[PDB]
GROMACS .gro file of C-alpha atoms in nm:
model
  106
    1UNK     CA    1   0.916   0.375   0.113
    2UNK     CA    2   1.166   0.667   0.221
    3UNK     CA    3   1.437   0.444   0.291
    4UNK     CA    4   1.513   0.612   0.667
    5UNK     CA    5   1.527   0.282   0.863
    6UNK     CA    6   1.629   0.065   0.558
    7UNK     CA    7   1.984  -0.090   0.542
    8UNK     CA    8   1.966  -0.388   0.342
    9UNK     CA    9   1.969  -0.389  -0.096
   10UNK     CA   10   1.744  -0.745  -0.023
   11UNK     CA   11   1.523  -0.562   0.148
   12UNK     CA   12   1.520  -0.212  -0.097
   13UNK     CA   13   1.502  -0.503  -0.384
   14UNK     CA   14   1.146  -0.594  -0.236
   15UNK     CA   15   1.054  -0.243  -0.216
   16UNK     CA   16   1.136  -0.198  -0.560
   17UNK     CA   17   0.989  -0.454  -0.675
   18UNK     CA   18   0.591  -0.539  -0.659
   19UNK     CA   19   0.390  -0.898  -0.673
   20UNK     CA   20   0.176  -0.956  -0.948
   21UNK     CA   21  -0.090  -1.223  -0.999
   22UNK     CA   22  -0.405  -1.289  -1.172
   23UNK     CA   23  -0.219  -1.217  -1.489
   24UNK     CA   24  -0.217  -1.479  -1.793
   25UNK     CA   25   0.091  -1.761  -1.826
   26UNK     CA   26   0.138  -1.676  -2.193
   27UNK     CA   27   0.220  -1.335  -2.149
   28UNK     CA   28   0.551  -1.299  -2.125
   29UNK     CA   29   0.771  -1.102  -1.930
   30UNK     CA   30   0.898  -0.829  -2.164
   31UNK     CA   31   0.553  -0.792  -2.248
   32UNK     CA   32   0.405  -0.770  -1.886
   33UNK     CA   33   0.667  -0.485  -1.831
   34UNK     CA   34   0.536  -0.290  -2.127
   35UNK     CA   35   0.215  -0.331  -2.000
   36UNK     CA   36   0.277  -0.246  -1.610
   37UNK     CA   37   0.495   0.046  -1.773
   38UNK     CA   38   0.173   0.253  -1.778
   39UNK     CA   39   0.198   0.344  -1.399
   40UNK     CA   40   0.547   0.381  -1.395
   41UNK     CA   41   0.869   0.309  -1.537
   42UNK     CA   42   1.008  -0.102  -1.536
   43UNK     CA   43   1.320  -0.150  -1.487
   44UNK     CA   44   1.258  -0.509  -1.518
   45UNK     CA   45   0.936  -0.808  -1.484
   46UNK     CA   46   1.039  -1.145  -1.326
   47UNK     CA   47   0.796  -1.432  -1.409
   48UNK     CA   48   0.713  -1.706  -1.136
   49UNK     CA   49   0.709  -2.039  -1.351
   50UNK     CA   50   0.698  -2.426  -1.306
   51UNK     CA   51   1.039  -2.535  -1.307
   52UNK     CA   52   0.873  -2.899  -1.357
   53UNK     CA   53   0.677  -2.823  -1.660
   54UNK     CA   54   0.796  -2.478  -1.767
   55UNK     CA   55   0.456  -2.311  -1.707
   56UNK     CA   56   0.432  -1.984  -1.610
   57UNK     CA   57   0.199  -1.987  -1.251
   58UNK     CA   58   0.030  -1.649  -1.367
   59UNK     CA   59   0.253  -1.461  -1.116
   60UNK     CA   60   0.552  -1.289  -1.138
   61UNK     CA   61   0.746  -0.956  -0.982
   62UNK     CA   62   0.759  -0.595  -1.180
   63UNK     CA   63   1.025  -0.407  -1.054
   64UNK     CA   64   1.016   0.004  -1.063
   65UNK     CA   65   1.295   0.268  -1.075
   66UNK     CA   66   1.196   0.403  -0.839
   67UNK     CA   67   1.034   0.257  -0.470
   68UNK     CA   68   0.793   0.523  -0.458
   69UNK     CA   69   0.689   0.427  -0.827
   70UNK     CA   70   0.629   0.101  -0.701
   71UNK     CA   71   0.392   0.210  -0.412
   72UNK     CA   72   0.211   0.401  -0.653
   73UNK     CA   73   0.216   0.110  -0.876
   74UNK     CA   74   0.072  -0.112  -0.669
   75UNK     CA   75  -0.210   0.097  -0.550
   76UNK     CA   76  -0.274   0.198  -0.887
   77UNK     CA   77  -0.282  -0.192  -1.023
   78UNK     CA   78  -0.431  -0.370  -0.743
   79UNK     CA   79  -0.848  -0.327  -0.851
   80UNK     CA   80  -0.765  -0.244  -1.175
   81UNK     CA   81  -0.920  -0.480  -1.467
   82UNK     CA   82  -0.689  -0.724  -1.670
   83UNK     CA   83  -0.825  -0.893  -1.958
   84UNK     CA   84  -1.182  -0.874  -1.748
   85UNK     CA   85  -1.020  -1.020  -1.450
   86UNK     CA   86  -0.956  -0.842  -1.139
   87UNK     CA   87  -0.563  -0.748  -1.115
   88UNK     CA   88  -0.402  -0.852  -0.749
   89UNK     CA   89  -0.096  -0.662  -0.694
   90UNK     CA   90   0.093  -0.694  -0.367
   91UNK     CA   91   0.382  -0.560  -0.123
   92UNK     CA   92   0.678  -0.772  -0.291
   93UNK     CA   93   0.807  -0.648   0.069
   94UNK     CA   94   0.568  -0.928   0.259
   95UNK     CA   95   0.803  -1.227   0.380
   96UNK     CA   96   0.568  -1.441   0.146
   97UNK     CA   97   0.688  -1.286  -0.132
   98UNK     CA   98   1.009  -1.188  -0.036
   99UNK     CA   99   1.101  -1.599  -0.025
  100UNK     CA  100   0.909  -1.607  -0.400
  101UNK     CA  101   1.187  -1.360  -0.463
  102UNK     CA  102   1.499  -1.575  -0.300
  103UNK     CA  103   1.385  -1.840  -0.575
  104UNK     CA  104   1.396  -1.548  -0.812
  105UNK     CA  105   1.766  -1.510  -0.682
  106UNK     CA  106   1.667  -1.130  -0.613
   0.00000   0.00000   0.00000
């Protein structure tokens, strides 16, 4: 994520920022960034929630200082066991995501 060819803050914004899932409803943002802290500093965790009910989907966005944190921190999450569940972390930078993150207003 050196930044050469990028131009656009949306686009930097997804590069920042990594997708999370498999991760539990009732944990809550300020504690998912504590606990995604561990492989790099979070500048901030957005939760993905039911805007019908108010229930958290068990995905969410955990965005790093640093781009090359959050390369690191996605390699270093995705595999890793969460509550005995296997952690999926993605490339926030995926157009799949990136319209997850529009909703977000990010």
């Amino acid at each position: 994520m050196a930044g050469l060819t990028v131009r656009d803050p949306a686009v930097d914004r997804s590069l920042r920022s990594v997708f999370v899932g498999n991760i539990p409803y009732e944990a809550t943002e300020e504690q998912l960034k504590d606990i995604f802290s561990e492989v790099g500093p979070v500048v901030s965790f957005r939760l993905v929630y039911d805007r019908e009910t108010g229930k958290p989907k068990g995905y969410g966005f955990c965005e790093y200082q640093d781009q090359e944190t959050a390369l690191s921190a996605m390699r270093n999450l995705n595999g890793r066991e969460f509550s005995g569940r296997a952690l999926r972390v993605d490339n926030a930078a995926s157009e799949k995501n990136k319209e997850e993150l529009k909703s977000l207003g990010t």
